[PDB]
Amino acid sequence: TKVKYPDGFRSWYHVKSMVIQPGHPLENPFGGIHHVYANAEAIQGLRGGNYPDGAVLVFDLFDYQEDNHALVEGKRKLIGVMERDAKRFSATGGWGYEGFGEGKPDKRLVTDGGQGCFGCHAAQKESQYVFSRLRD
Amino acid sequence: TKVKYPDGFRSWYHVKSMVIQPGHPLENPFGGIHHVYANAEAIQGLRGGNYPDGAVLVFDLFDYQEDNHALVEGKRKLIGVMERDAKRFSATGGWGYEGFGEGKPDKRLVTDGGQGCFGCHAAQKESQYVFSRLRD
Numbered sequence: 149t150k151v152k153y154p155d156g157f158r159s160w161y162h163v164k165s166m167v168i169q170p171g172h173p174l175e176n177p178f179g180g181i182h183h184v185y186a187n188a189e190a191i192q193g194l195r196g197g198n199y200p201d202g203a204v205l206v207f208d209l210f211d212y213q214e215d216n217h218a219l220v221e222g223k224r225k226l227i228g229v230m231e232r233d234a235k236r237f238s239a240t241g242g243w244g245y246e247g248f249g250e251g252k253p254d255k256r257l258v259t260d261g262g263q264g265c266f267g268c269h270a271a272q273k274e275s276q277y278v279f280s281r282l283r284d
Numbered sequence: 285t286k287v288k289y290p291d292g293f294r295s296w297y298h299v300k301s302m303v304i305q306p307g308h309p310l311e312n313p314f315g316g317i318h319h320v321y322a323n324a325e326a327i328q329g330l331r332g333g334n335y336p337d338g339a340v341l342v343f344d345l346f347d348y349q350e351d352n353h354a355l356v357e358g359k360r361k362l363i364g365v366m367e368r369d370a371k372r373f374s375a376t377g378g379w380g381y382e383g384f385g386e387g388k389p390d391k392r393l394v395t396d397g398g399q400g401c402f403g404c405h406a407a408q409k410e411s412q413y414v415f416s417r418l419r420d
């Protein structure tokens with residue numbers, strides 16, 4: 149019933165990025181520069197196919213530093229992970245939700261079975277609970 | 285002696301990202317959110333090896349829109365490309381420098397055989413003319 153740490157996710161396909169700055173409603177706790185990654189199974193779902201069990205999406209969140217009209221990546225704050233298992237994660241729409249503090253496998257963050265994560269993602273039911281869109 | 289368009293670069297390894305905001309010395313024409321990509325050959329150099337012939341680094345530059353203090357990726361502005369060939373690009377330290385307007389193969393931006401690009405990158409001679417560092 150646990151989401152696997154997504155070993156090697158830094159080698160995966162870069163889906164998209166966004167910056168959430170102070171003053172944005174999601175400033176706590178999603179503030180910073182985030183990169184979304186997708187393994188091969190997740191790419192099948194993102195392209196408009198279906199998500200196979202074993203699809204993984206990673207939200208990779210960096211702190212940033214203000215450097216002379218540049219925002220520069222600082223320390224990693226955390227990763228968010230969605231792992232596809234239609235049966236095992238059926239309580240949260242077939243995705244298991246987990247967070248890892250500083251992206252460390254030993255700092256698991258989710259305490260409520262991912263119901264809190266799923267509460268927000270449920271708005272995206274029509275895109276299989278995934279916000280991110282594939283871009284060129 | 286033209287740099288090849290780096291077909292499939294969006295499937296390559298994501299090295300790092302940075303935001304260049306208005307007022308930055310490099311705003312014209314590098315302003316926006318950029319993502320650095322490396323093919324397998326360029327990863328050998330970024331890890332501390334010699335960059336092999338065929339190494340390619342891509343600077344993928346997106347415009348952004350600030351919306352409620354989120355910076356949201358907009359349209360691709362351009363890609364910058366560095367292609368390693370010690371012999372064919374000897375005049376610019378063994379890297380060929382090109383830009384592609386909107387990331388399109390038909391929109392070549394470099395008009396001076398890459399001397400201006402090389403002029404700034406020459407400061408990084410000790411790291412084989414590459415600014416970006418591998419991060420985990």
Ligand code: HEC
Binds near residue numbers: 247
């Ligand atoms: C809104 C109130 C949210 C809560 C709570 C959670 N997430 Fe979420 N997530 C949200 C948005 C708006 C986005 C898109 C970001 C973008 O750049 O467009 C995301 C994205 C993810 C991703 C990437 C896949 C996707 O759906 O786009 C993952 C892997 C992810 N989120 C995981 C996650 C976890 C583990 C959370 C709770 C423990 C969680 N999210 C809460 C909005 C919201």
Ligand code: HEC
Binds near residue numbers: 302342364400405416
């Ligand atoms: C300084 C005055 C610059 C000029 C002119 C050019 N580039 Fe450059 N480039 C510069 C910096 C500071 C960086 C690093 C950005 C980061 O996020 O740290 C870069 C990066 C690139 C990359 C990525 C590889 C790397 O060296 O880090 C490429 C592929 C690249 N630049 C290409 C490029 C081309 C094609 C240019 C002119 C035609 C060019 N650059 C000019 C600084 C400067």
Ligand SMILES: [Zn+2]
Binds near residue numbers: 217307
């Ligand atoms: Zn200033």
